[PDB]
Design a protein around this nucleic acid. Sequence first.
RNA 1: UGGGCACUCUAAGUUGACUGCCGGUGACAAACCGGAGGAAGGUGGGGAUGACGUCAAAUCAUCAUGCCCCUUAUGAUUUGGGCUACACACGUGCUACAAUGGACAAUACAAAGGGCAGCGAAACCGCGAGGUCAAGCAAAUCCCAUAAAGUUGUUCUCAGUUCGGAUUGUAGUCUGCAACUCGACUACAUGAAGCUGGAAUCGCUAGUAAUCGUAGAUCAGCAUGCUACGGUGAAUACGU
RNA 2: AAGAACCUUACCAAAUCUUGACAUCCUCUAGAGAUAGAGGACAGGUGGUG
Lengths: 116, 82, 60, 97, 202, 155, 127
Amino acid sequence: RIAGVDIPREKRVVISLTYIYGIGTSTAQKILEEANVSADTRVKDLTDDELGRIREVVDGYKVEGDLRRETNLNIKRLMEISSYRGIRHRRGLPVRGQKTKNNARTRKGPVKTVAN
Amino acid sequence: ARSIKKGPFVDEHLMKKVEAQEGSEKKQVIKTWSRRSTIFPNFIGHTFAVYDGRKHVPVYVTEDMVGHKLGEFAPTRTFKGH
Amino acid sequence: AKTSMVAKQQKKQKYAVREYTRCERCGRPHSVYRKFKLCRICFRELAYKGQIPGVRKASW
Amino acid sequence: IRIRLKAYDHRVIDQSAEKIVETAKRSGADVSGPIPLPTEKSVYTIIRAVHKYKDSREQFEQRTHKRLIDIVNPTPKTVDALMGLNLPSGVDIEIKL
Amino acid sequence: GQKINPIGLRVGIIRDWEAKWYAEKDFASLLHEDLKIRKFIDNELKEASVSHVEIERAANRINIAIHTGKPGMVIGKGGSEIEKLRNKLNALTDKKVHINVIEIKKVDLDARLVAENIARQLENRASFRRVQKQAITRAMKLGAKGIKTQVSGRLGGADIARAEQYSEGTVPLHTLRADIDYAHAEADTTYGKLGVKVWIYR
Amino acid sequence: PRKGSVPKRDVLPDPIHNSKLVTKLINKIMLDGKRGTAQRILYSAFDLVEQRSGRDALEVFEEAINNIMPVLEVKARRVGGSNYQVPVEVRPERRTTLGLRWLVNYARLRGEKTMEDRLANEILDAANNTGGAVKKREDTHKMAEANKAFAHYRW
Amino acid sequence: VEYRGTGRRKNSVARVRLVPGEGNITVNNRDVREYLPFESLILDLNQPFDVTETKGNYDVLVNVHGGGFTGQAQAIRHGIARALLEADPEYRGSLKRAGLLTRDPRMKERKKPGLKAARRSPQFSKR
RNA sequence: UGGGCACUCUAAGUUGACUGCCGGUGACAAACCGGAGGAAGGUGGGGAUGACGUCAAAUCAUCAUGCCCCUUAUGAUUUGGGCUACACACGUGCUACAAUGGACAAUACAAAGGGCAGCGAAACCGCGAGGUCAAGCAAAUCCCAUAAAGUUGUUCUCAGUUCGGAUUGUAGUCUGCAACUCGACUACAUGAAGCUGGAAUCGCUAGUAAUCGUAGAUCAGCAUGCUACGGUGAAUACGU
RNA sequence: AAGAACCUUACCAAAUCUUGACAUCCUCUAGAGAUAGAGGACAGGUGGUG
């Protein structure tokens, strides 16, 4: 567990630490450069003094909650000023500018079909 | 989009009719055709009648809108469902 | 329409991203080659008579 | 001394491969044999139809044949006879000199 | 789309190019100069029996060899007529002093001349069957191994396009070791355009 | 087909065990033209079944193949509303093709961790008259046993 | 004492130089088992060494370029057979019996127009 | 690398594959089966080549053209927008649903092209896109350029996962007057459906099916499309 | 269609023009920009009928 978010045990540090929101693989590899952990020890074989070094580095980055709050106010701002990106956010449509004519499912969601 | 060397883009005539009136107190409803100009920090408290293609929709410029072009704030297409 | 867009293409535009290529023989704005300045149609007719030097049917 | 010729037709480049070695041996001079250089094939693929009938393509080629002839003993009578190029108006001559 | 163009199929194998020059660069302008000359020749030498026009280029000089069935009509009374042709071409871009006139003795043995002769009579309200048969008869009388002729579109002024095709002798369009002169001409009539095709094989 | 017979493409003997049968097994394991893996799959299984059984790798393989190869197939005839399942004895060449195919297919359909162990597992089971590979021929024989009444309909 | 026997397979050309001596096979100045990734290529390479008994009796100084490894391996094999006759020209009595002196013309196929790439066709449906 | 030009390549000419041949089945003859050289054997393999005609098939928007209309408009120049809109259905592909795999490092083997104000080395900076200076090459000479699948090891241990990369957030690179509508990319964060696809359906009997990358046309910039190039690469095809 | 930010665009909304965008003979200043100021028979039509 790091700062409230428990990572999967019996996993390598470089792999397990990505389970925290806001931290990916490239960021995780950065911890093991600062904190002297061999990136291969299981979280269950980890030593408490190694945990302190890891935890000190983690909060330095935008780890949890804050990144969730940051990403929301960014979209909320786009909603308030009614830009092209932000209006499409309201309607659940691809905001980048992809083709919504036939292929947009991870934004439209379920296929609510209309009969012919 | 642009670069850091090139910097921000505002149409060569657009800011001229912005620092034209800023020495006065009242903002105006300047008719606009350049949708590609970045909303500059000096664009504050100013209605920009940006051409969507058929009309000049007005837009009061707040601080948050600085950074995006005024074209993002002018809806071109219209859709009311299916 | 023709005879206006051809003259417009002949006329020098303002910028270096406004000009385009048209088949000088017919005025087609699509599929115009650069080594001959000819469209795929005008290329076929002129190469059949043999008015384009060195161009012959490929049969490899 | 590197006389090179480029031609669209292989027959006029074979004739150009000769006829200048013979004006090189017209004087007292050694000339290297015509070096066969790789030809350059430009391939064009166009749609035969004037509209929509795709998958029916007419393929055309244009082969630029190349030769290299090197004069090894350049005598004064060769530089004066170097203008005797019998070009059939379609064989490009490039004397490096 | 049935028949390949006879000229295009045999070009390079047994036929030879009309535009015979080399241009590694500036190919587009040099080629369009050829068409510019040919197009000007087409209307200036219209009533002259001109069959082929070869443009050659060497030492910033344009060589034109015009094969005609009516020498003297192009040349003039000693050279006056060809002089006007040379200087009118001369006014365009560079100098093109070389103009060579080649006599076509057997006019009825040339596809382009026969097709043009057929097309001009068709425009003058003539039988679309008599012009083909008489022209075919002349060529076979002149020793041609075989002649094929075809006239298409509103034959005689009808409301429906047709295609009258008459042939004599041997015209193998599938054999590559054979020189078949092919040419297409148009006859603009009151009822529309006509399509003339001639296949003279010698 | 209609015009005579088609000559077949032959294989060379295996590099290690010197068996054309072994090389053709590689040709079956291979997917998307990848010979490398297929060659490694078999040698990681031939050398593996030696540790399980104890006998020679090629000796167990020869025993197993015999216990997969079918002796009587069932080709289909037709009289009308009834389709005649006519039992036809398998020619020797088709037997090896079927035996090798059933070894690979019924090794893929199983699973422990990887393909090499699955292949090795199926090889030993076949020599012990167990597994899907030998259960396929037992059903192939069974259908030939049942339809002996259609034997004389062999074209 | 180089017996120059050329050999070509697909898009590869191998300059086989048979020299007397019992040793390894040096492909592009490299051992055959370090050059060819698989042994099956090394078996096909020694096919004419085995059809007529000369196994390992020559150190083939081969200069191969072009193709992949299977094309290079059989180009060496073809070159070896065309070089075994260069040493003793009374060797064909078994080389033609096993088909090793023939240049294999099974080179690739043209991308046929109208059909999807090679001899196969694209998807087909009915409207 | 001096030197040769031996081998190989490059491109011109020139041999060869013609049922010459040897048998045997037809001697109604054509033909057919096997064999011998020979690299290739039976039209050696591929390409181009598409008869009379058929479908009033397609194209008046390549172009021309009979007729019919507009001709201060049905013509014409500019800015902006649209051609990319999205309740959905259809055709054609791409990517995966991993262990014959993901990743991590080393380590090989091509072909075909293109290039003048273009290809752009080498060096330096940047996580990377890229940028700064730049040699050489109008090119079998220099550049694109490095093939990758492949080989060798290590790590994971079947899990919606170290599979998957759709979609969003942030900060950037290039091109272009200008990437908002509506470009390609690069980093960091996120991490969707998807556990090999029902009825039906298509392709193919070799270097094919399958699989991996490279190049070119168009082109300021923009391809999962098209055309070409090679690498690895199945097998029964008895039979009608 | 082997290449839609402008162009291509032939489509739409504004600013416009009418012997015309094209035949054939007879460096500053506003202004989105076009363009503007200062240093006549004829054309045309990606309009229709494959």
